[PDB]
Write a protein that binds this ligand. Structure first.
Ligand code: DGD
Ligand code: DGD
Ligand code: CLA
Ligand code: CLA
Ligand code: CLA
Ligand code: CLA
Ligand code: CLA
Ligand code: LHG
Ligand code: BCR
Ligand code: BCR
Ligand code: BCR
Ligand code: OEX
Ligand code: CL
Ligand code: CL
Ligand code: FE
Lengths: 82, 137, 340, 33, 448, 333, 33
């Protein structure tokens, strides 16, 4: 097989400089992901309904899209009646 | 949609008096229902007798009326037939027969109110799903 | 020339080969994978299906999915800048724009990968039979995720990218299409199961006809990639199956060609059948037996039994599986056996 | 039916006895080496 | 301890212990400790999660029912009266594990790697047919004594729990065990199919105790036999005599016993009391037909003349041999016997007069209970059929015990096939492949 | 030395088809099951499988084709009871109650089990390694699961897989409605085993064919570049590994043919082993994952998932399967 | 050895978002209705 030329993964993940850098970068990305949910930013970015944002106080009728081109406003008018 | 106090507000007796349960009280009545009722009463039906369900409309036409907290707690102490002609504690779990139904032993008076409440609150949330059967699954 | 300079860089011997096909493959494939991971983690399906389908909503790995666009969208491309989303990323996700995003980028990803197979095979110096074989997964993807919903009313009836969603797709095709009764799926089954048989029986035979080229009990060390000799006895393997099964392989080249043929042919056959289902052209019934059964209430086969099951599946799942139809079935119209 | 039962029972026994006595007849020795 | 000097890779590293009696002994004692450890650890675990007023089969218990079956910590009806014997069993097994582990580790990494040049008594060679049978004889006597411990427990030390006890289930002392060979060895000659059920159909503790007396004596006698004798000529020519070979012999045995234990825990409700393990499959189905028979009869239905949709009796029908049985799908389960159903059994099966008149409330409760506790549940422990909604957290211990051991039984059969075939090949001399300059087929004539 | 002559012919390696001691049992049983199957598939009268006096036609002469034809399982009235011919008052009764089904599968399971043992036997006679039979244990366990193990756990051979194409489909559909086999991690491993098997089969087949060393021209088959029993390998694994090692990355490819071929055996066998155990464990009603009404909103409304849609489909099979066999609300048997 | 290569990018394009996503789902386990 030989080796292509890049630095072997084995020696990198066993190097100190690597874990000096990645003992900060990896947890930060983890925390960043945590904050993306705990702040509730994920809900507003993707438009995913919160546990209290599926129905109104007295409806079981599914807010289903029935139109094609006016579908955007049809979803927006669903968000309004909440 | 949330668990508002008006949803948790259930009739107390048979003369109009009501009571608003708390959210934790409902979660307790849910946990206790799964503990000693769910085996025969999943979803408000009755596996060993599908002719009778835990629907509010059904409980109201029972004798004595069971569409309130006072009625259900009494049933959990001294259960009777739908017409109340005979007592059936010998074949139905109750405080009166907690010797042959051991799961009813550690149930306090507070525990009975929560269960009674959950039975009344649930159809106000699930609608006809409560006591409906596999059709409404 | 700049073309020749770029060609050198693209075809550099690396840990991960790129090539000209990489310009198409890598970005499309990354977006298809990323789009699915994004949708199954955050994006819902509440406005398209009336379903939860992300970890954020409480779904697990088996139940999460990127669901198909609403039926009212038709066969729309649902581009982000399209007339439906109108540049709004949030609305785009809520309408099912990520499904077409994955399906389309995933399609050109598969094209890029098959091209990658051609490209590398040309540089190495081997025949392109690996690329040829990969035409079967592509034919499957195209027929099922593209052609079938195109034949139907909308993208809605295409498979949703999810584990349980696929299981829905399976049972749907039983209740509505009677897909099991279709001979083109049957040939596909024979190809897949037959492929697994060939895969198991070849590896087992080779491993149990090995020559002794070492002193160790673990024979894996007794092989070298640059050796010129066969590592197992074709002669001994031939006599064995000749006496056990009656027939046996005598030609290694035909053996490994056949191992290509069986599962590839099967998938292509199942692909053809799906194309038919796109037009509701099903192998649903046998007219001869329907005539008999309708005239004779004492005639019953396993075929007539399965149709009763399909009738049950349809009437019981349709209102929720097709919420755009606004189906309302009173209990008394539901097909039910006794007691149950 | 009684005749059939006896017949099958004898047939089965015959073959089973062949299997037992057969493998008891020095089967490990029956190998190329 | 490497592939270069062993021949075996790391994933087959335990195969390096074949010719190392010392380390191998430590491995078998250390693993033995692991078994006793789990026994004690899981027992204390169940006890800490145990709720007395709840049935054992609603709390996911498998060890406590085993103890309770031995008549420890239970009373009339199988109700728990003392949790302390459960505690003792857990502690003692847990304490003993530390001992076995101590010697297991010692013999493995500190003890002599070979026992042959240390002690001729404990040293053994696989080829030594006389030594092997002696060790076989020893452990045989060990198993014989263990079976007599159950006998002693049942006859002298409190007895066992009898679900068939008069006036309801209770702990009873076995006074007259069945020694009649026509009964004991009668089970071994019964058919494994429906209505017969082989040894699984033992339905009284008298037979269970009497059986273990026979096994207790047979193993001791057989143990003495294999010590004072050496394998006969026909035996020496019929078997493969090596370490891996003996392993495959035991693997086949354990696989067989595994399948047997599965069917036993699924069908038998005598040594697996339904009070502890929950109702069996047949039992729960029978209990359902019982429940609606009672309910409908109260409403005024005539269950004897009630015609079902198919013409068959809706509540009562006949078995292929004529016996009066419950109607519906449960017709298949007409061979079911239970202490709650037998009171309604007559000489021709279910007696209609006892049904109309002599049904007692405790039978109605028992039927409804077992009906609503059928061994049906999902992998994430959701009670009921697959179409059921989330509410009841229940999967019967019978389902857990039957499935788990069937898996183990099957893989041990695979283990039998693997280690047996290789033992044959290794003894013959081609387990590592075919000799290139001496291929057997090349010396054989053509098939055509 | 007369019985020795018989033993030598039985264990003979010069027979066109190896007999062996396993074959001494295999040949009669397989012939018995086969002959009965062919006759029953063609000319057998209807069979009351559900034991409710509702006979199900399965043979060609009674209105079936190849697709709808089947040998129908024994009656539910029989259950797990052993039902040979001599236990019936007449062949007419025996046929009405699904007699042929038990006769075939029992002779078949015995024959098939001996078939596996027969595979070890010849390999021992030839000086081979004996684990090919272990690979055959994967489909054999699968057959044991649907023919023997599942009827045991359910309590009737009427719930065994019918000997027919449509009957097979009936077995699958009813199974899903009662066990949710799709949401079971063992069937999913089985799917991964057979999809992966087919993938790897197509994969191994394509890579070896691609790396074939030129020994022929364009006017003849490439297969003639290989001669039976030749010393040299017909392809170049070095080139093949060079290709697949660049298709992904080199450490995701096999350079060891023995290690590669072992993987080819391991993956689908292990996969089928699990799906075999899947049926075997679901036989004792340890069913697939149940996530019905798992997602709930703040108020308490059930927010459906794809699992709930699967449930609705399962409800449809459940309430319709064996429409006349149920008298009570819970399906236990 | 080179530090930043094509392989480097190929890694972090899968690496970085994965840990970010894992942290997100980790926070979702504490969401109550
Ligand atoms: C060397 C071996 C060579 C063998 C060669 C072939 C010899 C015959 C093989 C027969 C195989 C099994 C056939 C019967 C299967 C079965 O229905 O067995 C069921 C029986 C139990 O039968 C039941 O027994 C019950 C007993 O309960 C009764 O008694 C109880 C007492 O409390 C209760 O009262 C209860 O209510 C009452 O009904 C009833 O009689 C039932 O009607 C009856 O069905 O289990 C049992 O006999 C004990 C368990 C035996 C093993 C089970 C089969 C395992 C197969 C694994 C195959 C793996 C293959 C892998 C390949 C790779
Ligand atoms: C994707 C992941 C991939 C992982 C790859 C590695 C392979 C190994 C995977 C191991 C399992 C991973 C998840 C572990 C978490 C878990 O499971 O956690 C679950 C439980 C603990 O959770 C508790 O589980 C309980 C289970 O119910 C049990 O208890 C209930 C309440 O008392 C009831 O009594 C009920 O009847 C009874 O079944 C309840 O649901 C509790 O609410 C819940 O908190 O772990 C336990 O139980 C302990 C289980 C120990 C092993 C059990 C051995 C039995 C094996 C039987 C084999 C049969 C075939 C199986 C096919 C598959
Ligand atoms: C290999 C690269 C590649 C490919 C083949 C695709 C392919 C696709 N993407 Mg994807 N995409 C890519 C990379 C790629 N993408 C990247 C890297 C990103 C991240 C930045 C995205 C982000 C992305 C999004 C956000 C969306 C798509 C979508 C699409 C689809 C619609 C594209 C379209 O209409 O283009 C039209 C444009 C062209 C075909 C280019 C034409 C170029 C020629 C030379 C004409 C030049 C004209 C000249 C300059 C004059 C300009 C106009 C002037 C007169 C005013 C299609 C399946 C859409 C989708 O899936 O919707 C469901 C969508 O919304 N992609
Ligand atoms: C009593 C049981 C027993 C014993 C004492 C042995 C002993 C031996 N076996 Mg055998 N074997 C057994 C049962 C047994 N086997 C069974 C039941 C099977 C069928 C599955 C096999 C299949 C088998 C094979 C295929 C091979 C052996 C071999 C061996 C040898 C080496 C074993 C080794 O190093 O394993 C090392 C152990 C491991 C690498 C660990 C395996 C872990 C498994 C795969 C998963 C366990 C999952 C766990 C239960 C649950 C999940 C936990 C996880 C999530 C943390 C040794 C002579 C080898 C041989 O022939 O040597 C001469 C060999 O190749 N055995
Ligand atoms: C049931 C499990 C089990 C057991 C009992 C053994 C036992 C043994 N193995 Mg095996 N092995 C196992 C599983 C097991 N193995 C599995 C699953 C694998 C696959 C990975 C292997 C792979 C393997 C290989 C590759 C080799 C062995 C070898 C050995 C032997 C020497 C080990 C040694 O020198 O360790 C040295 C390790 C240490 C000194 C570290 C400490 C070890 C101790 C035991 C830890 C004890 C911890 C415990 C909590 C202490 C309790 C104390 C008490 C007072 C309470 C030993 C008899 C060797 C052999 O055959 O040699 C001839 C060998 O080469 N095994
Ligand atoms: C399977 C069990 C077993 C076996 C076969 C052996 C065998 C051996 N051990 Mg080991 N050992 C074991 C378990 C075992 N040990 C355990 C569990 C421990 C932990 C306590 C030890 C601790 C240990 C030590 C510390 C030493 C040995 C040594 C020895 C050697 C000499 C033993 C001797 O002369 O005993 C002669 C007999 C006696 C001293 C009297 C024994 C009385 C017994 C234990 C009474 C109880 C019997 C009862 C039936 C047990 C039931 C157990 C239950 C789990 C069923 C020999 C190789 C020695 C050695 O190798 O030195 C170089 C040594 O130093 N062993
Ligand atoms: C753990 C138990 C065990 C084990 C492993 C062994 C192992 C051995 N014994 Mg020992 N033996 C045991 C217990 C055991 N024995 C006990 C407890 C007794 C007292 C009864 C004896 C009495 C005994 C005698 C008298 C002899 C042996 C002999 C042998 C050797 C040959 C066995 C043989 O050929 O079996 C294979 C068995 C057969 C070929 C029998 C025929 C096949 C039948 C029909 C199988 C039916 C199986 C089927 C599933 C049905 C089972 C259920 C039911 C109907 C029976 C071997 C070393 C022989 C020897 O050489 O001793 C020195 C010998 O003559 N044993
Ligand atoms: C040790 C664990 C064993 C697990 C069960 C066995 C699985 C592999 C064997 C399948 C048999 C196929 C038919 C015969 C195929 C055949 O003939 O193989 C032949 C192959 C060649 O080995 P050798 O003959 O050189 O060595 C055999 C012995 O003599 C030991 O050296 O055997 C092995 O490689 C054994 C590998 C053991 C380790 C395998 C572990 C794989 C499973 C790991 C866990 C997976 C869980 C997945 C869950 C999703
Ligand atoms: C959409 C879109 C886009 C894209 C984005 C992306 C591309 C993203 C990505 C993302 C990502 C890329 C993510 C990832 C994730 C990952 C994950 C989340 C993972 C996980 C894993 C796990 C969970 C594991 C598991 C396991 C296994 C499998 C093995 C065995 C065992 C265990 C269990 C450990 C853009 C902006 C361009 C544009 C607009 C649109
Ligand atoms: C050989 C070998 C091995 C193995 C080993 C082993 C397996 C060991 C074991 C060991 C063991 C097996 C151990 C055991 C231990 C135990 C213990 C140590 C116990 C203790 C107990 C206690 C401490 C108790 C306490 C208590 C009491 C007293 C009462 C109750 C409660 C409590 C808890 C408080 C391995 C593979 C790793 C590797 C190397 C080789
Ligand atoms: C305790 C008890 C009891 C009893 C039991 C008993 C008494 C048992 C016995 C058992 C027995 C007494 C068993 C036996 C068995 C036998 C066997 C298991 C055999 C085997 C054999 C073999 C395995 C062979 C093989 C072969 C062949 C086939 C040919 C040649 C070659 C060879 C050798 C390989 C009862 C039930 C009453 C009750 C419950 C409790
Ligand atoms: O038979 Mn044939 O499938 Ca077994 O589950 Mn119950 O039974 Mn009837 O329903 Mn569903
Ligand atoms: Cl029924
Ligand atoms: Cl059906
Ligand atoms: Fe190959």
């Amino acid at each position: 097989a030989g080796t292509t030329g890049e630095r072997p993964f084995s020696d990198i993940i066993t190097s100190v400089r690597y874990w000096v850098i990645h003992s900060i970068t990896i947890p930060a990305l983890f925390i960043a992901g945590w904050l993306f949910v705990s702040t509730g930013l994920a809900y507003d970015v993707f438009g995913t309904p919160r546990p209290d944002s599926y129905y109104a106080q007295e409806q079981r009728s599914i807010p289903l899209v029935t139109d094609r081109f006016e579908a955007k406003q049809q979803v927006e008018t669903f968000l309004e009646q909440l | 949609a949330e668990l508002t106090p008006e949803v948790l507000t259930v009739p107390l007796n048979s003369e109009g008096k009501t009571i608003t349960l708390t959210e934790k009280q409902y979660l307790e009545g849910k946990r206790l229902f799964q503990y000693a009722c769910a085996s025969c009463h999943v979803g408000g039906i009755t596996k060993t007798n599908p002719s009778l369900d835990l629907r509010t409309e059904t409980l109201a036409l029972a004798t004595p009326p069971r569409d309130n907290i006072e009625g259900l707690v009494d049933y959990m102490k001294n259960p009777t037939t739908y017409d109340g002609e005979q007592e059936i504690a010998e074949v139905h779990p109750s405080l009166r027969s907690a010797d042959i139904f051991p799961k009813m032993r550690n149930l306090t008076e507070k525990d009975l109110v929560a269960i009674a409440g959950h039975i009344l609150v649930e159809p106000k949330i699930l609608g006809d799903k409560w006591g409906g059967g596999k059709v409404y699954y | 020339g700049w073309f020749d300079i770029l060609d050198d860089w693209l075809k550099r011997d690396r840990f991960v080969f790129v090539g000209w096909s990489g310009i198409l493959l890598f970005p499309c494939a990354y977006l298809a994978l990323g789009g699915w991971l994004t949708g199954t983690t955050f994006v819902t399906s509440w406005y398209t299906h009336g379903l939860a389908s992300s970890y954020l909503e409480g779904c697990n790995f088996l139940t999460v999915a990127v669901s198909t666009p609403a039926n009212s969208m038709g066969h729309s491309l649902l581009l982000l800048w399209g007339p439906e989303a109108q540049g709004d990323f949030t609305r785009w996700c809520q309408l099912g724009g990520l499904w077409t995003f994955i399906a389309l980028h995933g399609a050109f990803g598969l094209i890029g990968f098959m091209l990658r197979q051609f490209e590398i095979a040309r540089l190495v110096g081997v025949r392109p039979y690996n690329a040829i074989a990969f035409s079967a997964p592509i034919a499957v993807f195209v027929s099922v995720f593209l052609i079938y919903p195109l034949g139907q009313s909308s993208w809605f009836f295409a498979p949703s990218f999810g584990v349980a969603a696929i299981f829905r797709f399976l049972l749907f095709f039983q209740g509505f299409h009677n897909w099991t009764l279709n001979p083109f799926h049957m040939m596909g089954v024979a190809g897949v199961l037959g492929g697994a048989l060939l895969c198991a029986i070849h590896g087992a035979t080779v491993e149990n006809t090995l020559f002794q080229d070492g002193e160790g009990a673990s024979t894996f060390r007794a092989f070298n990639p640059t050796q010129a000799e066969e590592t197992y006895s074709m002669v001994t393997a031939n006599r064995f199956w000749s006496q056990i099964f009656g027939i046996a392989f005598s030609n290694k080249r035909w053996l490994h060609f056949f191992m290509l043929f069986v599962p590839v042919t099967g998938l292509w056959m199942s692909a053809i059948g799906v194309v038919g289902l796109a037009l509701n052209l099903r192998s649903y019934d046998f007219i001869s037996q329907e005539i008999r059964a309708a005239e004779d209430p004492e005639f019953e086969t396993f075929y007539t039994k399965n149709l009763l099951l399909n009738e049950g599946i349809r009437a019981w799942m349709a209102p929720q599986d097709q919420p755009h139809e606004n189906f309302v079935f009173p209990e008394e119209v539901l097909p039910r056996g006794n007691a149950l | 039916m009684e005749t059939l039962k006896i017949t099958v029972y004898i047939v089965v026994t015959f073959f089973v006895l062949l299997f037992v006595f057969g493998f008891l007849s020095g089967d490990p020795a029956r190998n190329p080496k | 301890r490497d592939q270069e000097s062993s021949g075996f890779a790391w994933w087959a590293g335990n195969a390096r212990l074949i010719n190392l009696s010392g380390k191998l002994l430590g491995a078998h004692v250390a693993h033995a400790g692991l078994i006793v450890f789990w026994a004690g650890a899981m027992t204390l675990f169940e006890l800490a999660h145990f709720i007395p007023e709840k049935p054992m089969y609603e709390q996911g218990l498998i060890l406590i029912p085993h103890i309770a079956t031995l008549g420890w910590g239970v009373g009339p009806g199988g109700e728990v009266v003392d949790t302390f014997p459960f505690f003792v069993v857990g502690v003692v097994h847990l304490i003993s594990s530390a001992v076995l582990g101590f010697g297991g580790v010692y013999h493995a990494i500190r003890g002599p790697e070979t026992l042959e040049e240390y002690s001729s008594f404990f040293g053994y060679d696989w080829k030594d047919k006389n030594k092997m049978t002696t060790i076989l004889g020893f452990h045989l006597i060990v198993l014989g004594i263990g079976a007599l411990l159950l006998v002693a427990k049942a006859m002298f030390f409190g007895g066992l729990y009898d679900t068939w006890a008069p006036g309801g289930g209770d702990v009873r002392v076995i006074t007259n065990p069945t020694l009649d060979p026509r009964v004991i060895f009668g089970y071994l000659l019964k058919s494994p199919f429906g209505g017969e059920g082989w040894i699984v159909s033992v339905n009284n503790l008298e037979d269970v105790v009497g059986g273990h007396i026979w096994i207790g004596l047979i193993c001791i006698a057989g143990g003495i036999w294999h010590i004072l004798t050496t394998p006969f000529g026909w035996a020496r020519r019929a078997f493969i005599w090596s370490g891996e070979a003996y392993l495959s012999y035991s693997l086949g045995a354990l696989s067989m016993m595994g399948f047997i234990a599965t069917c036993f825990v699924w069908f038998n409700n005598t040594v697996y009391p339904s009070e502890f393990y929950g109702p069996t499959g047949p039992e729960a189905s029978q209990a359902q037909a019982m429940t609606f028979l009672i309910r409908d009869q109260k409403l005024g239905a005539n269950v004897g003349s009630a015609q079902g949709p198919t013409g068959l009796g809706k509540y009562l029908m006949r078995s292929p041999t004529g016996e009066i049985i419950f109607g519906g799908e449960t017709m298949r389960f007409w061979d079911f016997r239970g202490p709650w159903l037998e009171p309604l059994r007559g000489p021709n099966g279910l007696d209609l007069n006892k049904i109309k008149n002599d049904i007692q409330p405790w039978q109605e409760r028992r039927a409804a209970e077992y009906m609503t506790h059928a061994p049906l549940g999902s992998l994430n422990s959701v009670g009921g059929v697959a179409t059921e909604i989330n509410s009841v957290n229940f999967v019967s211990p019978r389902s857990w015990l039957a499935t788990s051991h069937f898996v183990l039984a099957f893989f041990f059969l695979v283990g039998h096939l693997w280690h047996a075939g290789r033992a044959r090949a290794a003894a013959a001399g081609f387990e590592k492949g075919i000799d290139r300059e001496s291929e057997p087929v090349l010396s054989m004539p053509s098939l055509d | 030395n007369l019985w020795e002559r018989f033993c030598n012919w039985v264990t003979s390696t010069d027979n066109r088809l190896y007999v062996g001691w396993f074959g001494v049992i295999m040949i009669p049983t397989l012939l018995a099951a086969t002959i009965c199957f062919v006759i029953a598939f063609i000319a057998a009268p209807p069979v009351d499988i559900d034991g409710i006096r509702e006979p199900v036609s399965g043979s060609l002469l009674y209105g079936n084709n190849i697709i709808t034809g089947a040998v129908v399982p024994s009656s539910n009235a029989i259950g797990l009871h052993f039902y040979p011919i001599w236990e019936a008052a007449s062949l007419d009764e025996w046929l009405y109650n699904g007699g042929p089904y038990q006769l075939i599968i029992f002779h078949f399971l015995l024959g098939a089990s001996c078939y596996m043992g027969r595979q070890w036997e010849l390999s021992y006679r030839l000086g081979m390694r004996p684990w090919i039979c272990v690979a055959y244990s994967a489909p054999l366990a699968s057959a044991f699961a649907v023919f023997l193990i599942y009827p045991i756990g359910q309590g009737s051979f009427s719930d065994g897989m019918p000997l027919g194409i449509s009957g097979t489909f009936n077995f699958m559909i009813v199974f899903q409605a009662e066990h949710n086999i799709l949401m079971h991690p063992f069937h999913q491993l089985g799917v991964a085993g057979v999809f992966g098997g087919a993938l790897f089969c197509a994969m191994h087949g394509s890579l070896v064919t691609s790396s074939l060393i030129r020994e022929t021209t364009e006017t003849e088959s490439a297969n003639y570049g290989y001669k039976f029993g030749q010393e040299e390998e017909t392809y170049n694994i070095v080139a093949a590994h060079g290709y697949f090692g660049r298709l992904i990355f080199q450490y995701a490819s096999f350079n060891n043919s023995r290690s590669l071929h072992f993987f080819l055996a391991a993956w689908p066998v292990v996969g089928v082993w699990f799906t075999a155990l899947g049926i075997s464990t679901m036989a004792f009603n340890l069913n697939g994952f149940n996530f019905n009404h798992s997602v709930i909103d703040a108020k308490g409304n059930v927010i459906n998932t794809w699992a709930d849609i699967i449930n609705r489909a399962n409800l449809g099979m459940e309430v319709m399967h064996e429409r006349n066999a149920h008298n009570f609300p819970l399906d236990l048997a | 050895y080179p530090i930043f290569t094509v392989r480097w990018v190929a890694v972090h394009t899968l690496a970085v978002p994965t840990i970010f996503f894992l942290g997100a789902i980790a926070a979702m386990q504490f969401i109550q209705r």
